[PDB]
Write an enzyme that holds these catalytic residues in place. Structure first.
Site, PDB file in Angstrom:
ATOM      1  N   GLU A  15       1.972  -1.814  12.636  1.00  0.00           N
ATOM      2  CA  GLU A  15       1.275  -3.082  12.705  1.00  0.00           C
ATOM      3  C   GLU A  15       0.911  -3.599  11.323  1.00  0.00           C
ATOM      4  OE1 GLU A  15      -2.584  -4.981  15.036  1.00  0.00           O
ATOM      5  OE2 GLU A  15      -2.095  -2.842  15.198  1.00  0.00           O
ATOM      6  N   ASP A  27      -3.717   4.547   8.410  1.00  0.00           N
ATOM      7  CA  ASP A  27      -3.324   5.727   7.643  1.00  0.00           C
ATOM      8  C   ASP A  27      -3.754   6.997   8.339  1.00  0.00           C
ATOM      9  OD1 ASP A  27      -2.486   7.576   5.757  1.00  0.00           O
ATOM     10  OD2 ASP A  27      -3.198   6.422   4.042  1.00  0.00           O
ATOM     11  N   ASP A  37      -9.550  10.900   7.327  1.00  0.00           N
ATOM     12  CA  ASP A  37      -9.483  10.182   6.057  1.00  0.00           C
ATOM     13  C   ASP A  37     -10.125   8.788   6.153  1.00  0.00           C
ATOM     14  OD1 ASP A  37      -8.941   9.892   3.356  1.00  0.00           O
ATOM     15  OD2 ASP A  37      -6.796   9.541   3.626  1.00  0.00           O
ATOM     16  N   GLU A  80       5.486   4.683   0.259  1.00  0.00           N
ATOM     17  CA  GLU A  80       4.905   3.379  -0.009  1.00  0.00           C
ATOM     18  C   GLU A  80       4.997   2.514   1.245  1.00  0.00           C
ATOM     19  OE1 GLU A  80       7.200   2.334  -3.606  1.00  0.00           O
ATOM     20  OE2 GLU A  80       5.336   2.558  -4.732  1.00  0.00           O
ATOM     21  N   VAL A  81       4.065   1.576   1.383  1.00  0.00           N
ATOM     22  CA  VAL A  81       4.052   0.663   2.524  1.00  0.00           C
ATOM     23  C   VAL A  81       4.356  -0.755   2.082  1.00  0.00           C
ATOM     24  CG1 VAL A  81       2.741  -0.288   4.428  1.00  0.00           C
ATOM     25  CG2 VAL A  81       2.352   2.079   3.718  1.00  0.00           C
ATOM     26  N   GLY A 102       0.787  -1.222   0.000  1.00  0.00           N
ATOM     27  CA  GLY A 102       0.000   0.000   0.000  1.00  0.00           C
ATOM     28  C   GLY A 102       0.820   1.273   0.000  1.00  0.00           C
ATOM     29  N   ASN A 152      -8.844   2.542   4.024  1.00  0.00           N
ATOM     30  CA  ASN A 152      -8.116   2.770   5.280  1.00  0.00           C
ATOM     31  C   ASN A 152      -8.663   1.980   6.468  1.00  0.00           C
ATOM     32  OD1 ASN A 152      -6.366   4.492   4.000  1.00  0.00           O
ATOM     33  ND2 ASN A 152      -7.378   6.382   4.683  1.00  0.00           N
TER      34      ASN A 152
HETATM   35  O1  LIG Z   1      -0.991  -4.236   6.952  1.00  0.00           O
HETATM   36  C1  LIG Z   1      -0.921  -2.873   6.899  1.00  0.00           C
HETATM   37  N1  LIG Z   1      -0.534  -2.097   7.909  1.00  0.00           N
HETATM   38  C2  LIG Z   1      -0.565  -0.792   7.524  1.00  0.00           C
HETATM   39  C3  LIG Z   1      -0.241   0.417   8.222  1.00  0.00           C
HETATM   40  C4  LIG Z   1      -0.360   1.645   7.577  1.00  0.00           C
HETATM   41  C5  LIG Z   1      -0.816   1.685   6.215  1.00  0.00           C
HETATM   42  N2  LIG Z   1      -0.997   2.877   5.453  1.00  0.00           N
HETATM   43  C6  LIG Z   1      -1.432   2.674   4.184  1.00  0.00           C
HETATM   44  S1  LIG Z   1      -1.631   1.008   3.970  1.00  0.00           S
HETATM   45  C7  LIG Z   1      -1.126   0.507   5.544  1.00  0.00           C
HETATM   46  C8  LIG Z   1      -1.004  -0.753   6.194  1.00  0.00           C
HETATM   47  C9  LIG Z   1      -1.248  -2.074   5.772  1.00  0.00           C
HETATM   48  C10 LIG Z   1      -1.743  -2.495   4.403  1.00  0.00           C
HETATM   49  C11 LIG Z   1      -2.172  -3.890   4.023  1.00  0.00           C
HETATM   50  C12 LIG Z   1      -2.761  -4.218   2.800  1.00  0.00           C
HETATM   51  N3  LIG Z   1      -2.988  -5.549   2.807  1.00  0.00           N
HETATM   52  C13 LIG Z   1      -2.563  -6.038   3.974  1.00  0.00           C
HETATM   53  N4  LIG Z   1      -2.063  -5.036   4.716  1.00  0.00           N
END
Ligand SMILES: O=C1Nc2ccc3ncsc3c2/C1=C/c1cnc[nH]1
Ligand SMILES: [Cl-]
Length: 289
Positions: A92, A154, A136, A29-30, A23, A141
């Site tokens: 997390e 987010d 948001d 980017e994450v 993401g 999210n």
């Molecule tokens: O696990 C996640 N923890 C996050 C923390 C902040 C964040 N800010 C934007 S995405 C995202 C994610 C995130 C995305 C995701 C998508 N599929 C599985 N996990």
């Protein structure tokens, strides 16, 4: 100062195994990652600070807000690292995907919609009790654990209310989900999140928010000018009324998150969160064709 900033001697490329992109936040980017000491999976947002100005105070606000949350309904923040010019923000990981992802195989039923909205409301109730506003809220999210737990993510534009600043007026959010008073940059507070929740409820029911077919610039006048959206189609009256309660042009006419937790649509339809694993399994089977 940046809350949770780790020893600048520590090397995140050593401490974490960086995996695939999952993401993106406001700037970075994450990525899925592995904590090399615990083997727990984490989410790692990477921001290039050299490639960034005005952004850094936004980044600090985000991490400050996140570091002050301690709730089963808000993504955990573990700390931050610097590697050359890049900031590694460790958060997390939630392996179920976002509510939006889980809509790709097909519609939700009203039990699923009510359960996800109920958990979002638990998250909003927590934030608003801390005088925090997410700003948001949208299905992208809203993240699920592989066990069906539902968490808000987010905090890129999240805001803090204080006794010297009771309301905010900053233009932030994602246009289709933004409240009319936020768009017009009037004084606003937690009730703005309640409007975004109503849009999210439509999103969960229909797959997309109102106006999703239009250029986002158009909603800059449409949302303040038009009557609020309603949920159209074959949905229960309680769900339509849940949506209407959230989507009032007058913020003081919107219920609180705490109040919405007792709304008849929620009480009559929400079930155990563990049942949401079926939705996660569905998305996995679908992804695999
Ligand atoms: O696990 C996640 N923890 C996050 C923390 C902040 C964040 N800010 C934007 S995405 C995202 C994610 C995130 C995305 C995701 C998508 N599929 C599985 N996990
Ligand atoms: Cl998980």
């Amino acid at each position: 100062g940046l809350p949770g900033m780790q020893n600048l001697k520590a090397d995140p490329e050593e401490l974490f195994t960086k995996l695939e992109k999952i993401g993106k936040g406001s700037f970075g980017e994450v990525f899925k990652g592995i904590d090399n000491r615990t083997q727990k999976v984490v989410a790692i947002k990477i921001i290039d600070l050299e490639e960034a100005e005005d952004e850094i105070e936004d980044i600090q606000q985000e991490i400050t807000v996140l570091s002050q949350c301690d709730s089963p309904y808000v993504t955990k923040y573990y700390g931050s690292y610097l590697k050359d010019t890049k900031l590694w923000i460790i958060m997390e990981y939630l392996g179920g995907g976002s509510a939006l992802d889980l809509l790709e195989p097909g519609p939700l039923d009203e039990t699923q919609i009510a359960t996800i909205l109920r958990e979002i409301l638990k998250g909003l109730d927590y934030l608003h009790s801390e005088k925090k506003i997410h700003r948001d809220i949208k299905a992208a999210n809203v993240l699920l654990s592989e066990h069906g737990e539902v968490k808000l993510a987010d905090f890129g534009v999240a805001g803090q209310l204080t006794d010297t600043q009771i309301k905010r007026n900053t233009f932030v959010g994602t246009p289709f989900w933004m409240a009319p008073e936020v768009i017009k940059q009037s004084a606003y507070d937690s009730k703005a999140d309640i409007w975004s929740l109503g849009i999210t409820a439509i999103e969960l029911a229909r797959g997309e928010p109102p106006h999703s077919e239009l250029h986002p610039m158009k909603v800059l006048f449409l949302i303040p000018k038009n009557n609020p959206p309603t949920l159209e189609g074959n949905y229960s009256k309680p769900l339509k009324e849940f949506v209407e309660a959230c989507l009032n042009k007058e913020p003081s006419f919107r219920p609180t998150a705490k109040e919405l937790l007792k709304h008849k649509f929620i009480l009559r339809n929400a079930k155990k969160t563990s049942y949401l694993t079926e939705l996660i399994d569905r998305y996995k089977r679908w992804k695999a064709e």
